Design a protein around this ligand. Structure first.
Ligand SMILES: Nc1nc2c(ncn2[C@@H]2O[C@H](COP(=O)(O)OP(=O)(O)OP(=O)(O)O)[C@@H](O)[C@H]2O)c(=O)[nH]1
Ligand SMILES: [Mg+2]
Lengths: 393, 1183
RNA sequence: GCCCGGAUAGCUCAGUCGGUAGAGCAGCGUGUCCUUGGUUCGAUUCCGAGUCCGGGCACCA
């Protein structure tokens, strides 16, 4: 818009996940204000994160919010995700832009169903690192309860291939730190240090062909249509031609400006949360789940063989088997598509807790490749987690 | 192919659709009998058309609703399975779990319903388990998921006490009427007081003991005892009997009228005996009074419970308040009931306390959620509460939605409970009317009056204000009973003064009606100052002005009307105070979750709380293996215990069984059965334990399948134990183990659960299996249908009831089943069809001739059909390669039963031991009760073989005894028994002496020089060892499987097998028969595999013959080498090739079997030498 | 992105106490009621998700 976004520090994409009402938005506000006290910062408030009228009315986060803050060594784009089970899809989209996740677990509650669900979904959408912030430690004076919560969270993290015994856990209080209690702002500073150290600087593919999964579409008045998201690979520059691939027929356009947190950029690099302005496309012709690609570099597909683990009842999955013709929703990076399932020869039903090799045919072509992890959701619950073994058509 | 196998398995092996239809028909015919159940219950199950489902209303009783749901589930499952047969996995799964949902309904279903339903639904439990197991292999394979026993032959094991107990007891007491009356009482007490399993009357032992004691015995004490029996004991027994029949729903007097007649006869004879030694009518006045008082108390209980509306109103208020929250207010509360205001929580708790049991019965988990959300303090954190994972899953849900989703079910349950109470009240009314009718009929159909009746006493109430609920409830029920008494008195007044007006608009003729009418309101007329009128009327009506007693009709009517009004007002006051006391006691008690406690009692919770697994494990580890170590010979004990004193628990689930001796294999199978029983019981108890206070238990249909699977395993294992218990040396410990599992036969959802073999040509069996896969018979079926329609269309003067139509339909079905597997000879079909046509013509002309000619013609038809079917069955037996006289007898029996039914509905060594006991007991009685001693001896010595020579010895010794009618005969009998017991011991691995000493002790106890008997036994042992050393079973089986050319054939065949995997290559294949000619079935099978051209039928038949030769040995290697399922899968030539490969791959296991036979001989010689050493030691020590 | 409402024969539609879908027209209906699951003895019917369509809100790199 006005500034130019001088590039000084390495950029990391982090975000808050966890069960509903456990303190993710308060943690984001506290982090930003404490870092603005200690360093430059911007000091965003709670109301500026949850600003939609529906969010204020219901008192919950509904859509993911984006903030930025700078430690001395890093620049962080932070995604605040909803915790309510009804809006898990939105959280998934946020979790698709995360190089790291802060798992907010309330000490007064401990791990909850959405804690496990968010861990699993972030694992499926590519979150490689999790830091636990034990929130609401100003309401739990007991230490045995804190140790029990810590061990439960570590076991839950280890259940999904995260290094539970190595994941840092911060016993803090987002509300007290936001209020101004210095003893509790030290915990936010420790969490920022853990963000700096525990999460390594990601290796970005700035040489591969450009690719950007679309997370949100805006209609900027007087400018046009902007697609926001994290550049998976490559570099997008102003004036370059791009293709919109995915749900509908692939379209062609040109990039007429790249921004990043309302600051002009000459080129958008891999791993950066950027907004790209496209020439001559209406807001209704693009949607979340489509992909911006270099022309002639991505072919959408509908059919693929995959190895899928079906969650058990105790993990929040199905409690009954499903048969051929099951039509659940498949969640790739920012895409959710209805698909039909074909079971392997000799198998007619799949029980909860099973590992199967099935062929999925989606109702719309989407951009995907071998080794791309995905989630399966149906009836408002996660029912499976698989990886694309190979692409058929 | 797999789906076709599943479909054929469902249609022909399980026959699930037919089983469901039969169970539904039997249940519906039993619950609409009208001779066992009252018409009140039967009217609920009347349908305009049989194709419509039963409609479950909120206004029908609870048990009627359960029965309707079960019948609908059975019909739906039958429909789904029949649709499957007409063509699949999803449909079968849905039908199976609908049956399981019905079973879960039965699990929570009020043991009266359980005993009504169990005998019928027990017929498909193994079928459901097998269907679920078959469905399980369409899913991905899960190793160690079940880890249970292999269900080898379960498909072949697929399978009035209450009304007769009391009459039998009172008949026995009738039979009990110096020392003669001193042991009969003991015998009767032992016979009757030991009986149980039907004591739903929760006092039975007290009545039996008190009645026996009183029947064992100035006249004042005897009269007091008689009145105690007549007024306290027998009325209580009758009232409990009526309670049982009312809870069941049976017709009035079904099991109370025969019992009542029996006790009436017993009491009359006892009173006659007492009078002869020195009143007795059993229905004088006060037996009737007490019976009617109890009946009215129960009726008022039911009516009060039915007219209660506080629970339903409280549930409605609770659900309205919970549903009054919109989306905004739910969001403000964070969709949790714990976040609402304290006053709202108090109101919700007040509402919920009144209907918590109904909510918790259906939703044990939502009940806990509601209790924790409403009663916990908000200050306490969730972490300290230590909630479980699934409890936290339920806790995170929208609480308002979860509670609101229970509204329809909870309201339906409450209204159905009210309907159940009203239906029980109607049943009690019918019972009261029938009891009055029987009381009238039993004496003379006449009534007797008395002027010494205590007048009416209208009770008044001076009641406290701070007393518990029962205090006011008792007074309410007393007032209601008095209201009923006054009501019947006023009805009697109306009848009396209507009959008087209608018979004469005191020296009359039909004084019985006036007597019975005045007996109802005599106390009320005596309450007013009318004693003179009462004493002037009783005598006048028992021995002989009617114009003056009609004057005081309005007065007595007004008295009754005002007394009823006062009682009603007092009842309203008492009800108000009782409701206030109920509110106070609800406020005092804190709210506590009830779901787990209710789940602990369903049917499987009761079985789980028995801890049968612990007792089974204790017997297995302490009583079973100790007996095994003590009794088994060391050689046999070595194979079971490598530690010398404990079973090899590292390898308890043995799986080979073909490298062991028959006795060792039997012991290993017994150990496997005990282990599987223990594991299944432990798993069942773990799944049905609800002792975690921090966990929720969701009620669902998808657990019953697991339960059923476990039950199946246990029963399967238990079956083998019984099979292992049919051995002389293993009866005791096996019987003890089964006594431990006794509390399993009796639970409705398990029961017996199981059953508790031809040899035909291999080609014939394969063709039969192929025919049953691909599914004259049509002609005979059409003829039977024509016969059935001719019988149905019979509209002549000889009316045929619909029951007879159903009976002839059942007979025609049985006949069709019997003849469906019958092959007819040339011209036999014509003869049988002509005979059946003549039979159907006769049936169509039943009314056209006299009954004598009809019966003669049908007898001739029966004889002709029986002869023709005998001949056809013999032809089929010859052509199927079976044994003569087996199938023909069954066919003739089917024909005879069919014809007898049609004419009716249209208007052993055990014997040797019994003979031995009879002769030995008649020897002293003829040279100086018996049946009981003989039966006890035979039962205690059941299981002896007696061989073919000892039979002649027994006959000769019995002849000698008969000729002579001293100890020589008894010695011969004893040594015959000892030889049989030695055979039994040697067949098992028992140590020498034990069972033989046991049987000898039993024989000598029943009875009330030794060196010769010991020498005879020693000679028997030496000859047995000599015979064993001559055994050549191993070499014979080796020769039979692969003769003395196997090594050379294998060596010259391996290159050919390699060549199997160009133009001149076939030359060696053609010329192999001049250098590698097979001589044994295994080598012939290898050559056939070399041929590989299984398309032709010649080599298919050759493979069938080779498999027929090899099957008796392969069946020990694996149970799947049977003659039914193995032949069923041989459809395509590729299947034949696969079977040939599978049989070829088992040469190593066949060699292992031969080595195991050699080891069996090696062990048998050691057992024989140990027995001989023991016997020579005993002989040398005895001198 | 968040709500709301619809989808039943070739066309127009009734079916609501949850008990096998029927009226007109068109030329006597395997239309299990858009699809997928769940609850239920039983689902067009109740609950959820999804695919289209319609119109109300939100937002603005
Ligand atoms: N005592 C205490 N309260 C806290 C703390 N952190 C958050 N809260 C309270 O918990 C509530 C949770 O609010 P949010 O932080 O917005 O919840 P969320 O993590 O965003 O979860 P969503 O509603 O799904 O977005 C807030 O109203 C805070 O008042 C804490 O550290 N200590
Ligand atoms: Mg939030």
């Amino acid at each position: 818009s006005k500034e130019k976004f001088e590039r000084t520090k390495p950029h990391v994409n982090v975000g808050t996940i966890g069960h509903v009402d456990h303190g993710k938005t308060t943690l984001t506000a506290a982090i930003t204000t404490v870092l603005a006290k200690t360093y430059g910062g911007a000091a965003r408030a709670f109301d500026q994160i949850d600003n939609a009228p529906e969010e204020k009315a219901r008192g919950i986060t509904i859509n993911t919010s984006h903030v930025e803050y700078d430690t001395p060594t890093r620049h962080y784009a932070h995604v605040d995700c909803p915790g309510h089970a009804d809006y898990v899809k939105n959280m998934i989209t946020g979790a698709a832009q995360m190089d790291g996740a802060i798992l907010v677990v309330a000490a007064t509650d401990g791990p909850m169903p959405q804690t496990r669900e968010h861990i699993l979904l972030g694992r499926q959408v590519g979150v490689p690192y999790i830091i636990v912030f034990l929130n609401k430690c100003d309401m739990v004076d007991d230490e045995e309860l804190l140790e029990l919560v810590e061990m439960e969270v570590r076991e839950l993290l280890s259940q999904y291939d995260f290094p539970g015994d190595d994941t840092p856990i911060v016993r803090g209080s987002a509300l007290k730190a936001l209020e101004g209690d210095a003893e509790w702002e030290a915990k936010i500073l420790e969490l920022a240090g853990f963000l700096d150290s525990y999460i390594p600087e990601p290796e970005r593919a700035i040489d591969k062909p450009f690719l950007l999964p679309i997370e949100d579409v805006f209609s900027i008045s007087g400018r046009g249509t902007v697609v926001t998201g994290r550049v998976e690979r490559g570099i997008i520059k102003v004036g370059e031609e791009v293709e919109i691939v995915g749900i509908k027929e692939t379209q062609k356009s040109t990039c007429t400006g790249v921004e990043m947190f309302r600051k002009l950029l000459d080129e958008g690099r891999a791993g950066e949360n950027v907004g790209v302005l496209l020439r001559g496309i209406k807001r209704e012709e693009i949607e979340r789940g489509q992909v911006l690609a270099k022309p002639g570099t991505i072919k959408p597909h509908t059919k693929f063989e995959s190895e899928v683990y079906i969650l058990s009842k105790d993990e929040g999955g199905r409690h009954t088997p499903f048969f051929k013709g099951y039509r659940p929703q498949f969640y790739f990076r920012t895409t959710d598509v209805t698909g039909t399932i074909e079971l392997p020869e000799g198998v007619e039903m799949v029980m909860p807790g099973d590992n199967i090799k099935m062929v999925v045919t989606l109702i719309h072509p989407i951009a995907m490749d071998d080794g791309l992890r995905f989630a399966i959701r149906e009836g408002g619950r996660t029912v499976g987690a698989g990886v694309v073994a190979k692409v058929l058509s | 192919r797999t789906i076709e196998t599943y479909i054929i398995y469902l249609k022909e092996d399980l026959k699930i659709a037919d089983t469901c239809k039969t169970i539904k028909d039997g249940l519906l015919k039993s619950i609409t009998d009208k001779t066992h159940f009252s018409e009140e219950l039967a009217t609920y199950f009347e349908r305009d058309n049989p194709n419509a489902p039963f409609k479950v209303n909120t206004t029908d009783p609870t048990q009627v609703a359960v029965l309707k749901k079960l019948l609908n589930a059975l019909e739906n499952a039958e429909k789904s399975f029949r649709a499957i047969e007409n063509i699949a996995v999803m449909v079968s799964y849905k039908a199976v779990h609908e049956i399981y949902a019905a079973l879960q309904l039965i699990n929570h279903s009020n043991s009266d319903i359980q005993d009504i339903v169990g005998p019928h639904i027990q017929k498909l439990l193994p079928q459901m388990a097998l269907a679920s197991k078959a469905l399980g292999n369409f899913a991905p394979e899960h190793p160690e998921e079940s880890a249970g026993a292999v269900l080898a032959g379960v498909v072949n094991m697929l399978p009035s006490n209450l009304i007769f107990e009391l009459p039998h007891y009172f008949e026995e007491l009738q039979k009990l009427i110096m020392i003669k009356k001193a042991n009969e009482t003991k015998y009767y007490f032992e016979q009757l007081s030991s009986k149980s399993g039907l004591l739903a009357i929760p006092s039975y032992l007290s009545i039996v003991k008190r009645l026996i004691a009183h029947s064992t015995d100035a006249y004042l004490d005897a009269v007091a005892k008689l009145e105690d029996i007549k007024h306290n004991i027998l009325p209580q027994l009758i009232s409990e009997l009526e309670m049982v029949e009312e809870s069941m729903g049976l017709k009035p007097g079904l099991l109370t009228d025969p019992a009542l007649e029996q006790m009436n006869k017993y009491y009359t004879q006892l009173a006659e005996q007492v009078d002869n030694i020195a009143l007795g009518v059993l229905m004088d006045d006060v037996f009737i009074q007490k019976r009617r008082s109890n009946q009215e108390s129960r009726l008022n209980e039911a009516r009060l419970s039915s007219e209660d509306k506080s629970v339903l109103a409280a549930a409605n208020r609770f659900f309205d308040k919970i549903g009054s929250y919109n989306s905004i207010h739910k969001a403000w509360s964070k969709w949790s009931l714990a976040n609402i205001s304290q006053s709202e929580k108090d109101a919700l708790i007040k509402e919920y306390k009144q209907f918590q049991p109904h909510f918790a019965a259906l939703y044990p988990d939502i009940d806990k959620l509601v209790v924790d959300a409403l009663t916990q303090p908000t200050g306490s954190n969730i972490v300290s509460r230590l909630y479980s994972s699934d409890y936290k899953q339920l806790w995170s849900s929208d609480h308002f939605k979860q509670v609101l989703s229970c509204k329809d079910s909870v309201l339906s349950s409450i209204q159905q409970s009210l309907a159940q109470s009203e239906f029980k009240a109607k049943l009690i009314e019918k019972t009261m009317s029938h009891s009055e009718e029987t009381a009238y009929s039993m004496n003379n159909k006449t009534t007797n009056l008395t002027t010494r009746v205590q007048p009416f006493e209208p009770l008044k109430f001076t009641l406290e204000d701070d007393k518990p609920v029962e205090y006011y409830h008792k007074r309410v029920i007393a007032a209601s009973n008095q209201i009923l008494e006054l009501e019947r008195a006023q009805k009697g007044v109306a009848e009396f003064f209507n009959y008087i007006q209608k018979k004469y608009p005191l020296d009359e003729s039909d004084k019985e009606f006036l007597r019975k009418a005045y007996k109802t309101f005599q106390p009320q007329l005596l309450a007013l100052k009318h004693d003179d009128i009462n004493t002037r009327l009783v005598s006048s009506l028992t021995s002989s002005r009617l114009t003056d007693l009609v004057s005081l009709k309005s007065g007595i009517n007004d008295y009754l009307n005002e007394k009823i009004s006062d009682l009603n007002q007092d009842k309203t006051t008492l009800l108000d105070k009782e409701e206030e006391a109920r509110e106070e006691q609800y406020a005092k008690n804190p709210l506590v979750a009830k779901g787990a406690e209710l789940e602990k009692q369903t049917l499987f919770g009761q079985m789980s709380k028995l801890k049968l697994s612990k007792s089974v494990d204790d017997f297995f580890n302490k009583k079973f293996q100790t007996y095994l170590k003590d009794n088994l010979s060391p050689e046999v004990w070595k194979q079971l215990s490598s530690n010398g004193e404990t079973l090899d628990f590292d390898k308890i689930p043995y799986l080979e069984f073909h490298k062991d001796s028959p006795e060792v294999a039997m012991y290993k199978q017994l150990i496997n059965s005990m282990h599987y029983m223990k594991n299944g019981l432990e798993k069942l108890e773990s799944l049905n334990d609800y002792g975690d206070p921090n966990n929720i238990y969701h009620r669902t249909r998808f657990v019953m399948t697991t339960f059923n699977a476990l039950v199946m395993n246990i029963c399967f294992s238990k079956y083998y134990v019984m099979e292992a218990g049919n051995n002389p040396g293993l009866k005791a410990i096996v019987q003890e183990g089964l006594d431990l599992l006794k509390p399993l036969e009796g639970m409705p959802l398990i029961g017996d659960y199981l059953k508790t073999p031809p040899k035909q040509n291999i080609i014939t069996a394969w063709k039969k299996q192929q025919a049953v896969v691909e599914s004259d018979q049509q002609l005979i079926s059409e003829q039977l249908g024509k016969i059935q329609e001719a019988i149905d269309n019979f509209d002549g003067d000889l009316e045929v009831s619909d029951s007879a139509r159903e009976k002839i339909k059942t007979q025609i079905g049985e006949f069709a089943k019997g003849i469906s597997g019958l092959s007819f000879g040339p011209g036999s079909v014509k003869k049988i069809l002509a005979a059946l046509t003549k039979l159907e013509t006769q049936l169509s002309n039943l009314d056209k001739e006299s009954p004598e000619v009809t019966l003669g013609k049908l007898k001739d038809i029966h004889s002709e059909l029986n002869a023709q079917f005998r001949a056809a069955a013999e032809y089929t037996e010859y052509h199927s390669g079976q044994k003569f006289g087996s199938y023909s007898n069954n066919i003739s029996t089917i024909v005879s039963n069919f014809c007898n039914g049609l004419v009716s509905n249209l208007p052993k060594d055990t014997s040797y031991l019994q003979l031995i006991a009879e002769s030995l007991y008649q020897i002293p009685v003829k040279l100086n009760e018996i049946d009981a001693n003989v039966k006890a001896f035979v039962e205690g010595l059941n299981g002896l073989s007696f061989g073919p020579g000892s039979v002649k010895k027994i006959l000769s010794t019995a002849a000698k005894l008969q000729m002579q009618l001293l100890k020589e005969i008894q010695a011969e009998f004893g040594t015959i028994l000892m030889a049989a017991a030695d055979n039994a011991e040697f067949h098992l691995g028992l140590k020498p002496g034990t069972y033989s000493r046991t049987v000898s002790e039993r024989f000598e106890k029943f009875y009330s020089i030794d060196t010769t008997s010991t020498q005879k036994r020693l000679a028997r042992e030496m000859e047995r060892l000599e015979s064993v050393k001559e055994d050549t079973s191993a070499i014979d089986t080796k020769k039979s499987i692969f003769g003395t050319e196997h090594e050379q054939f294998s060596t010259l065949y391996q290159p050919y097998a390699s060549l199997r995997h160009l133009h001149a290559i076939d030359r060696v294949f053609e010329e192999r028969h001049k250098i590698n000619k097979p001589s044994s079935p295994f080598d012939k099978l290898r050559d056939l595999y070399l041929d590989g051209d299984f398309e032709k039928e010649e080599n298919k038949e050759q493979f069938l013959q080779l498999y027929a030769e090899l099957q008796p040995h392969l069946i020990k290697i694996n149970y799947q080498y049977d003659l039914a399922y193995f032949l069923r899968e041989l459809q395509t030539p590729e299947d034949f090739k696969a079977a040939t490969e599978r049989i070829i791959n088992d040469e190593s296991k066949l060699q292992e079997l031969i080595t195991g036979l050699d080891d069996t001989k090696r062990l048998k010689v050691k057992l024989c030498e140990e027995r001989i050493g023991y016997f020579i030691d005993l002989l040398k020590k005895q001198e």
